[PDB]
Amino acid sequence: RPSFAGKEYSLEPIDERTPILFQWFEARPERYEKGEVPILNTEHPYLSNIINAAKIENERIIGVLVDGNFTYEQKKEFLNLENEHQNIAIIYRADVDFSMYDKKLSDIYLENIHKQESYPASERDNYLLGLLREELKNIPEGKDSLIESYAEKREHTWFDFFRNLAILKAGSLFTETGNISPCSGCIYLDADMIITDKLGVLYAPDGIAVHVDCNGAIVVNRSNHPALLAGLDIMKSKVDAHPYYDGLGKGIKRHFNYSSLHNYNAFCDFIEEGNPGII
């Protein structure tokens, strides 16, 4: 049985019923010519990979979590794609309930402000405290929300933050639209990946495996997997908190009790996600 940091874990299976999830967060949808689904499809055949995956895995649902200021015409191009390939679900980030994961931005800053203020004045770190208080004061009115603050960003931490939250939701991300249980896992794939014939059943230590760093893939055997909740917990306590490096990497590392005493190549070997069907 799989083991790491001295502790043993079961190799949990991920059903052939498990949905597959892609993500496309588009900061300039107005660059796409009229009549095209606003997913990059050049050199980078992301829209083709997604369509191909839904072709191959005919017994699964292939979701694409999308976000960006898409026009009426682009939204109708999405519905046309759903109507062609009838196992592709286009899920808009703004229609998803993420409320169970949120936390006020002010409480994250306040908890860190209080932590720094509790050191004796000779060690206090007043420059950091000045940076923290300025961030607390500049929280926009009515947007005192960890999730809302990432919803309005438009660079790659926008994508990264909601990738983590989508995999937390896993099966429940699909069922809360309109087969799959809210408690089932998901297979998250980067859009640059090509499936070459079906995946079958997957196996993951403690129900999670990843092909990512700390061509990505994350697989979980259930929603609200504890290794992703560990990363959420860092997003809720650490002001800097990068969604990828902290919300994904450090979280999964902390869940498995990884430390500087361990070998990253051993950890990687232990958590790795590989399949011969995925190029």
Give backbone dihedrals phi and psi of 229, rounded to 5 degrees, phi first.
-65, -30
Tell me how far apart the alpha carbons of residues 134 and 111 are, in angstroms, rounded to a whole number. Answer: 14
Q: Do 272 and 210 meet the contact criterion of CB atoms below 8 Å apart?
A: yes
Q: Which of 89, 123, 144 represents a domain boundary (last residue)?
A: 144
Q: Distance between CA atoms of 272 and 270, rounded to whole angstroms?
A: 6
Q: Are residues 200 and 276 in the same domain?
A: yes
Packed helices 156-169 and 226-235: angle between N→C axes, nearest 10 degrees: 140
Residues, the chain: 279
Residue 140 and residue 12 share a domain: no
Q: Which domain holds residue 273?
A: 1-104+145-279
The answer on 190 and 127 residing in a single domain is no
- How would you write the chain as a 3-class SS string? CCEECCEECCEEEECCCCCEEEEEECCCHHHCCCCCCCCCCCCCCHHHHHHHHHHHCCCCCEEEEEECCCCHHHHHHHHHHHHHCCCEEEEEHHHCCCHHHCCCHHHHHHHHHHHHHCCCHHHCCHHHHHHHHHHHHCCCCCCCCHHHHHHHCCCHHHHHHHHHHHHHHCHHHHHCCCCCCCCEEEEEECCCCCECCCCCCEEEECCEEEECCCCCEEEEEECCCHHHHHHHHHHCCCCCCCHHHHHHHHHHHHHCCCCCCCCHHHHHHHHECCCCCEC
d(CA 115, CA 152): 28
List the one residue out of 134, 273, 147 whose CA is nearest residue 215.
273
Considering its fold, how many domains does the chain have in total?
2
Interatomic CA distance for residues 163 and 140, integer angstroms: 24
Non-local (6+) Cβ contacts of 202 within 8 A are 13, 14, 18, 187, 209, 219, 273, 275
Beta strand 208-211 pairing with 202-205: unpaired
What φ, ψ does residue 71 adopt, rounded to 5°? -75, 165
Residue 165 tokens read as: 């939250």
Phi, psi of 129 (to 5 degrees): -60, -40
Q: Rounded to an integer, what distance in angstroms lies between the CA atom of residue 167 and that of residue 219?
A: 8
238-254: burial string, b at 16+ Cβ within 10 Å, e else: eeebbbbbbbbbbbbbb
d(CA 231, CA 245): 9
Distance CA(36)–CA(260), nearest Å, equals 48
Domain boundary (90, 116, 144) is at: 144
> Which strands form 20-25's sheet, in the order they lie side by side?
88-92, 62-67, 20-25, 184-189, 217-222, 208-211
The vertex-141 CA angle with 139 and 147, nearest 5°, equals 65
Burial of 47 (0-12, 13-18, 19+ CB in 10 A): buried
Task: Specify whether 3 is located in the same domain as 123.
Answer: no
Question: Domain check: are 131 and 7 in the same one?
Answer: no
Question: What sign has the CA pseudo-torsion 22, 225, 254, 203?
Answer: negative
Residues with Cβ within 8 Å of residue 117, at least 6 apart in sequence: 124, 129
HSE toward the beta carbon, residue 170, CA cutoff 13 A: 25
Token representation of residue 156: 């790659």
- Shared domain for 213 and 256, answered yes or no, is yes
Pick the last residue of a domain from 144, 173, 196: 144
For residue 156, give the nearest of 242, 71, 215, 227 by alpha carbon. Answer: 242
Q: Indicate whether 114 and 140 sit together in one domain.
A: yes
170 shares a domain with 152: yes
Q: Which residue has the tokens 């990828």?
A: 244
Distance in angstroms (rounded) separating the CA atoms of residues 62 and 85: 10
Same domain, 153 and 112: no
What's the resolution in A?
2.1
- Separation in Å, CA 262 to CA 239, 257, 267, 279: 26, 9, 8, 30
Check if the beta carbon of residue 90 is closer than 8 Å to that of residue 74. no
Q: Are 74 and 109 within one domain?
A: no
Same domain for 241 and 255, yes or no, is yes
Residues 158 and 31 in one domain: yes
